[PDB]
Structure formats: structure tokens, C-alpha cells
């Protein structure tokens, strides 16, 4: 009986995205969600859903939907997939083996590239161990890769974990920035709040 459009627009048509290690998350509920407009758009270079056909999102009903948005490198889009390992997969963002949802990615060289280099996007190089699926690492303590203490001092045996992408418009196709939005659909014994455009 609930009839209103939920805000897919400000999460897709946003001006500035978050970093790789500080990916955002938006709660979505009480929705008449229309996924046909997103699927029919040709602006997305990559659109892969795992376990669900994309045309059938209209008749399905879900309880809650999670939208996660960030920006990564061109070659690193392969790492956003279940059962994958890599610099970002192991240390920044992890997908469970039983992940259900869609992955959306498109090139964003027009906004996230600067002739002098866009350094507003960060990613983690080093950490003690791989992180469990669906958690965020925000602490920026200086890494322990040696014997000598840190005491808040940067130097040998004390490596800064975060690195910055050198995004420039003249970079190769692999080095171009890409904006990635992943949708995770969870269903359980709860009153569903995200349904599709169907007349009862």
C-alpha cells in the first residue's frame, strides 16, 4: 500500500564519492523501487548481478537494500566479486561468497581527473591481516612492518598504510577512475519494505 519513490538519484547522480577504505552505506526502505530505468541506461560500462537476473528485479520484494558507493582504479574492478583476493579485496572491501545483489561501475574520468593529479581518493596498502566481509577500517595508525617502535613517528619500520591514486586525464584506460556502486539485497523473515511497481 506504500507508494513513493525512494532516492536512487542522489546516490547515483552524486557530485563527490567516498574513498575506497571509507566507502559509504545508505539505508533503503519503504520503496516502490523501479530498477528498469537503471538497467536500461547505457551509461554503465559494467553491470553484473550474482544470483538474480537483472530484468526480474521488478517483481521481487526485499526487506532492506544497502547501497555502497566508492571510486577505484580501472584494473581493480575485477576485485569486486565474490571469492576474490587482491590489494583492495583483502585490505579495503570484501564480498561474501554468498553475496546476492548487483554491481554497477562506470568510467568517471570527466569528474575525478585533474591535470595536476586528484589526491582526494585514498586506499590502504598494508594491514596486519585480511578483514572479514562487510566491515570498514578507519583507524590510521602507522603500520608495524619492523622492530623499531613508532611512538607516532613516521620512518623505517613505521609505514603509512594509506596511498593516493594519481588520477590524471592523460592516464591509460587501466588507470582511469571508475565509480562503483554495489547493491546488496537481503531477504529473511521480516515484513518486506522494498517492492516493485506492481498493481495489486
Amino acid at each position, epitope marked *: 500500500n506504500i507508494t513513493n519513490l525512494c532516492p536512487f538519484g542522489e546516490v547515483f547522480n552524486a*557530485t*563527490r564519492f567516498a574513498s575506497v577504505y571509507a566507502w559509504n552505506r545508505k539505508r533503503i526502505s519503504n520503496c516502490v523501487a523501479d530498477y528498469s530505468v537503471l538497467y536500461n541506461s547505457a551509461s554503465f560500462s559494467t553491470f553484473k548481478c550474482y544470483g538474480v537476473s537483472p530484468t526480474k528485479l521488478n517483481d521481487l520484494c526485499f526487506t532492506n537494500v544497502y547501497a555502497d558507493s566508492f571510486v577505484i582504479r580501472g584494473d581493480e574492478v575485477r576485485q569486486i566479486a565474490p571469492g576474490q583476493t587482491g590489494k583492495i579485496a583483502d585490505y579495503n572491501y570484501k564480498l561474501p561468497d554468498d553475496f546476492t545483489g548487483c554491481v554497477i561501475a562506470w568510467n568517471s*574520468n*570527466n*569528474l575525478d*581527473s*585533474k*591535470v*595536476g593529479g*586528484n589526491y582526494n581518493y585514498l586506499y590502504r596498502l598494508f594491514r596486519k591481516s585480511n578483514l572479514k566481509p562487510f566491515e570498514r577500517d578507519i583507524s590510521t595508525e602507522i603500520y608495524q612492518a619492523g622492530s623499531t617502535p613508532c611512538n607516532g613517528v613516521e620512518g623505517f619500520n613505521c609505514y603509512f598504510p594509506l596511498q593516493s591514486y594519481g588520477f590524471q*586525464p*592523460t592516464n591509460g584506460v587501466g588507470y582511469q577512475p571508475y565509480r562503483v556502486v554495489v547493491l546488496s539485497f537481503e531477504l529473511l523473515h521480516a515484513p518486506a519494505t522494498v517492492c516493485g511497481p506492481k498493481k495489486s
Partner: antibody
Amino acid sequence: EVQLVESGGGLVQPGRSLRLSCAASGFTFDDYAMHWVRQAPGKGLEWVSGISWNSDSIDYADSVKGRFTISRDNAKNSLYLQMNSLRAEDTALYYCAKDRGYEILTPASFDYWGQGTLVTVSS
Amino acid sequence: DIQMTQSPSSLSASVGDRVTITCRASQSISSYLNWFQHKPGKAPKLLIYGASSLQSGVPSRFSGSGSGTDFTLTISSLQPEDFATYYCQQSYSTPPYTFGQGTKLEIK
């Protein structure tokens, strides 16, 4: 649906300063870059200066370096442009354009403009 | 520095004609060109951002194409509201936002 109205056009002597403003009302001014464009009376468009979504990165054209100081006021949706030591070649028409992105030097173009304010540098 | 050039100088057509305006870049700009319609009586507008991406709010009659060092813009009909000057702007090289010269279009 966006509005961009400027002010500060007039008649000044060479080497004298005058102050520009530009009012934005049809969009959200706090997350876009802004640029200033110059149109000579008998020539084509020319880029002058630009500022980021916040006062972090500022770039100037080569011919206007050390003379212009582009400002910004996110509180009331208004930017500024202080021109100092004006010469006779700066008697052109100045537009107040808006950038599609949030940075100054990006492959993003200028989507919306506004009617210019004509300035003259003569006695 | 990059030099941005306009092949046509002045063109004339009819209400049911079709003309093409071309703009040549000295150095490769990788499909990062923009086209602007500057009506001499008011503020200029934007028609096509990027090589062949058409901005919302203007008729789909206009169509752009080209990449590298060769570009072209075409108008299918030249309707009685299309008389203006068209500029091609590059946004890829170190000199920021270099504009090409004008191209007057008077239909007669």
C-alpha cells in the same frame, strides 16, 4: 532554471581597480566549481580564472596572473572577482559560468552561463 | 601550448538544408571537445559536452562526432531559431579551456 546575474561593470581609468559579484539561485552553490570568461568586443571567448567547490585550488590565466583574485562566499551563494591594475585591453565582456564538476582543471565543461556585464577601460 | 582551429568561416543554408561545422585540434585531445552556441544577443549555451554526448535541454537534431585531432558538428535542418555562432573548446591540454574562433551561420 538557474540564474546567474553579475554586477560591477562601468568606466575606469587604466591601472584602477573595480569589483565584480555574481548571484546564483537556481542550484546548490556549495558543491560546484565556478569560472570567469572574457569576451572581447571583436574576438572570441577566453578563459580567465576558476575556483573549486571550496577555496582550495585556484588557477589563473597566463595573461591575468598577479592581477586578479577570485573569491567565493558559500554562505549566500555568491562569488567575486577583484581585478587590479586594469589596462586598455581589459574592456571586454565578462561572463559568470558554472562548472559541471567540483574541481577547476577537469575534462568537465561549462554547462550554464549568465548574461555578462560590460566593462570599459578608458578616459 | 595547444592551437585550436576552425575550418569554416561563414556558412549559408536554408530552412530545409543540412550543413556540417568541423573543428580541428593541432594535438590529440582524446574526444574531450565541447560545442557552444553563442547567440549574440544573450548568454551562450552548451549543446554537446564530450565528443558525442548531447546535453539535456536542447533538441536531439544536433549530433557531434570525432576523436583525436579531427572533429565535426552537423545540423540536420537549420531551423529558423538556429542562427548563431558556434565555438569548439578543448579541455585536455595544460592551457586551460582553449576556445576556437567563431563560425557565423546566416541562413539565406
